[PDB]
Curated annotation (Swiss-Prot):
Residues 88-284, 318-478 form the SIS domain. Residues 197-198 are annotated as: Important for interaction with GCK. Regulates glucokinase (GCK) by forming an inactive complex with this enzyme. Acts by promoting GCK recruitment to the nucleus, possibly to provide a reserve of GCK that can be quickly released in the cytoplasm after a meal. The affinity of GCKR for GCK is modulated by fructose metabolites: GCKR with bound fructose 6-phosphate has increased affinity for GCK, while GCKR with bound fructose 1-phosphate has strongly decreased affinity for GCK and does not inhibit GCK activity. This is Glucokinase regulatory protein. Beta-D-fructose 6-phosphate binds at residues 107-108, 177-179, 493. SUPFAM superfamilies: SIS domain. The gene is GCKR. GO terms for biological process: carbohydrate derivative metabolic process; intracellular glucose homeostasis; negative regulation of glucokinase activity; protein import into nucleus; protein localization to nucleus; response to fructose; response to glucose; triglyceride homeostasis. One of its GO terms (molecular function) is kinase inhibitor activity. Beta-D-fructose 1-phosphate binds at residues 107-108, 151, 177-179, 346, 493.
Length: 585
């Protein structure tokens, strides 16, 4: 029948109680799993949210049990990180015709960009020509934009990679997809494998390959799973690498901007630093060099969440403000400015949030007096501003801008990074009551820019910001258990995540879930055989423009009713969350 093919790969809903025993749960990729630590995340108060998300983030450094999935500290992963450092070094010693590309979509794209800059800085500092570049689904504009639709074309990934690989002779492509999921990446990797004279593909993600996506890519013939299975075979002769440790599920299910973005930096910074440090010394990279850096990143988590109670309070001020239709501003310098901009933007697609609700500023790139005259006027008593800097920044810009903001608003707070025994100039000191200071012990550093100091702080800020943004919106009641129910379907992955959420919360069959989702999407047009048979992009393009697609589809199933009936029920309830909660009872 029509639609049987497009949905061939979908697993049937299990009958109640045999979720485990049907083998459906064992097929849910780790990156899409519900994290059991957060099954009651929607009931936690602010301090528990922080405690629960800090605990989920720490799963990154947790070791393998005794059967089970390799992890970051497993010897198969570290031995792969070594071999990859090894190949990065071959390129470092022959920079003529050599290039290192870091490519991802969404947050994997954002991460790739940061790291390409840093390692380019490092090489400038040594007087060598920069060898790093990034690639982000949707071009470079995507780095600071919410643009979830762009990851779905393989050809587009292959074009972008063909532009940048110019007339180079040895190219390392590090494709980053947390879920081993994005067709953008899949196409790059497959292309590298069709020309291993020039290309070396390295695939980075956090699912076992056996959970990689296996649904058809619209412009391509292989699935992500097949591409990855073929890379893994090539690794035996060291012509491709798959670097995929499990790091456990996300605190908010499928939200791979959190743990997944963090692990991506931890994993790649570690490995590239190791490679640079050890070329200088004319020594091969080794597990022991990687470990030093890895443990430093793991100290960084401890150091960061030891400041939890102040994180919980920044959380509340952020949540309070948005409950009143207020706005929230994130202001910081150099690379922490950017990380602020990334976090705010991600709130758009993650929570259905307006660009103004949580916006980030770099001193989007609005400098000292430009921000004073432009943004400063339009503030208000309920808003919130957050300053993010090190005590090595122009601390004179800092004090100024806060002084003016303290006039137009009082819900300020800040995030400050210091080496130990650095002190807060007394004007600045006095403007912040409960302040978030994070002091970093002395560490001896090989290079001029102190790149390891940079990485720790970027990462620690990421964790604080992500925990605040996510926590703030959970507090508002917009998350259901640990799922975001009311997402906007803007790509095929989210299409599937929606369908899985319908199977999970409805318990009804695969065919009914799918029918209800397509009706919801395409309403007011009815299911035709064309629509049943259409490629997933057709449903995505139409869902992307609508509101409450998933809750409307769920209600339809629970009440066993039409789309007309569920829509009017929804509009006759105080809110979405309210209506779904009641219906779930
Ligand atoms: O497209 S898939 O090959 N892989 C999908 C998913 C697969 C899958 C399987 C069970 C439950 C949820 C999900 S989501 C995938 C894999 C890695 C990273 C992200 C994503 Cl979306 C697929 C496989 C099976 C699916 C399914 C999708 O739709 C969801 C409902 C269950 O059936
Ligand atoms: O790295 P992946 O699995 O290929 O995910 C690619 C992007 O969709 C992902 O980063 C997404 O943008 C974020 O909103 C996840 O919270």
């Amino acid at each position: 029948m029509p639609g049987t093919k497009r949905f061939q790969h979908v697993i049937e809903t299990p009958e109640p109680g045999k979720w485990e025993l049907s083998g459906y749960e064992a097929a849910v990729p780790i990156t899409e799993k519900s994290n059991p630590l957060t099954q009651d995340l929607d009931k936690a108060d602010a301090e528990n949210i922080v405690r629960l998300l800090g605990q989920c983030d720490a799963e990154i450094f947790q070791e393998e049990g005794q059967s089970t999935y390799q992890r970051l500290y497993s010897e198969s992963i570290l031995t792969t990180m070594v071999q990859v450092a090894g190949k990065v070094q071959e390129v470092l010693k022959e920079p003529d015709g050599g290039l290192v590309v870091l490519s991802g979509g969404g947050t994997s794209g954002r991460m790739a960009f940061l790291m390409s800059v840093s390692f380019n800085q490092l090489m400038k500092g040594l007087g060598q020509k920069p060898l790093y570049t990034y690639l982000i689904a949707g071009g470079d504009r995507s780095v600071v934009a919410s643009r979830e639709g762009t990851e779905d074309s393989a050809l587009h990934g292959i074009e972008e990679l063909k532009k940048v690989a110019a007339g180079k002779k040895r190219v390392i492509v590090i494709g980053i997809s947390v879920g081993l999921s994005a067709p953008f990446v899949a196409g790059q990797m497959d292309c590298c494998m069709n020309n291993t004279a020039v290309f070396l593909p390295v695939l980075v993600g956090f699912n076992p390959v056996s959970m990689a996506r296996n649904d058809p890519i619209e412009d391509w013939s292989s699935t992500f799973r097949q591409v990855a299975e073929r890379m893994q075979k090539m690794q035996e002769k060291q012509k491709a690498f798959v670097l995929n440790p499990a790091i456990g599920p996300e605190g908010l299910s499928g939200s791979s901007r959190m743990k997944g973005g963090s692990a991506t930096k931890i994993l790649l910074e570690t490995l590239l630093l190791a490679a640079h440090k050890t070329v200088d010394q004319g020594i091969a990279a080794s597990q022991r060099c990687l470990l030093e850096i890895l443990r430093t990143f793991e100290r960084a988590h401890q150091v960061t969440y030891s400041q939890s109670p102040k994180i919980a309070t920044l959380m509340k001020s952020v949540s309070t403000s948005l409950e009143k239709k207020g706005h929230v501003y994130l202001v910081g310098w150099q690379t922490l400015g950017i990380i602020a901009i990334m976090d705010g933007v991600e709130c758009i697609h993650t929570f259905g949030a307006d660009f103004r609700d949580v916006r980030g500023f770099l001193i989007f790139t609005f400098s000292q007096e430009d921000f004073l005259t432009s943004i400063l006027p339009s503030l208000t008593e309920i808003d919130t501003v957050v300053f993010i800097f090190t005590l090595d920044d122009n601390l004179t810009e800092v004090q100024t801008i806060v002084e003016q903001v303290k006039e137009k608003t009082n819900h300020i707070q800040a995030l400050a990074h210091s080496t130990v025994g650095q002190t807060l100039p007394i004007p600045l000191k006095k403007l912040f009551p409960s302040i978030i200071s994070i002091t970093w012990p002395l560490l001896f550093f090989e290079y001029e820019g102190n790149f390891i100091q940079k990485f720790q702080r970027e990462l620690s800020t990421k964790w604080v910001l992500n925990t605040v943004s996510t926590g703030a919106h959970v507090l508002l009641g917009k998350i259901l258990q640990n799922h975001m129910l009311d997402l906007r379907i803007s790509n095929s992955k989210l299409f599937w995540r929606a369908l899985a959420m319908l199977q999970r919360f409805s318990g009804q069959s695969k065919a009914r879930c799918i029918e209800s989702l397509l009706r919801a999407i395409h309403f007011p047009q009815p299911l035709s055989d064309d629509i049943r048979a259409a490629p997933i992009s057709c449903h995505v393009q139409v869902a992307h423009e609508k509101e409450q697609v998933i809750p409307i589809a769920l209600l339809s199933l629970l009440f066993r009713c039409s789309i007309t009936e569920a829509q009017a029920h929804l509009a006759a309830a105080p809110s979405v969350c309210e209506a779904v909660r009641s219906a779930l009872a």
